[PDB]
Amino acid sequence: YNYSYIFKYIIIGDMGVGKSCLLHQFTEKKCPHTIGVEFGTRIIEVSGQKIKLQIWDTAAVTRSYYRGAAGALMVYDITRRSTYNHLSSWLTDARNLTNPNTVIILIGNKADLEAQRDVTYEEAKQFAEENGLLFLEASAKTGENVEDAFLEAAKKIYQN
Ligand SMILES: Nc1nc2c(ncn2[C@@H]2O[C@H](COP(=O)(O)OP(=O)(O)O)[C@@H](O)[C@H]2O)c(=O)[nH]1
Numbered sequence: 001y002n003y004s005y006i007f008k009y010i011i012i013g014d015m016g017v018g019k020s021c022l023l024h025q026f027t028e029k030k031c032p033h034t035i036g037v038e039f040g041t042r043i044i045e046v047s048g049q050k051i052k053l054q055i056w057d058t059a060a061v062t063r064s065y066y067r068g069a070a071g072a073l074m075v076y077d078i079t080r081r082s083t084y085n086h087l088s089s090w091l092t093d094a095r096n097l098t099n100p101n102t103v104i105i106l107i108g109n110k111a112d113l114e115a116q117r118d119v120t121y122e123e124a125k126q127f128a129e130e131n132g133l134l135f136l137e138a139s140a141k142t143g144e145n146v147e148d149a150f151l152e153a154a155k156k157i158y159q160n
């Protein structure tokens, strides 16, 4: 496919929140023994425009990809409050290490584990709003809201 832009995304968050899984769900749209996908690409369509997305689970060239990041998916696990409590630390890196146009989107992953919910939708939304973040709850496992996660960022990126 004949893209016209390249948006670089980072994905960041505590270990085990589902970053690789989110990346794989988005880039393959579908192996516990594996380390887990680190990097991926996908040509999406956003406002009648074809854009190549580069997506990197980042946890020299790394610093240069950071500085050129159009978007940043900041991920927590809704079943583990500690991953939510670490969000201000990730946001500091996400802001400090990228550039002034970088669109940050908060993702509350593992939403399918509803019986294990440890963080409310509401408190997380208030954090997002306070910090000017887009915010979705998602499930990398089922695929619920995973495209929207990547596509919502991309639409806001395109407006600049
Ligand atoms: N139930 C559920 N498990 C998930 C989800 N996303 C990831 N996992 C599991 O969480 C574990 C760690 O996921 P991974 O993507 O490697 O996390 P990472 O360390 O953030 O890259 C694995 O056993 C995944 O199968 C999800 O949306 N729902």
Ligand SMILES: [Ca+2]
Pocket (backbone or CB within 6 Å): 019, 020, 035, 036, 037, 038, 057
């Ligand atoms: Ca990973």
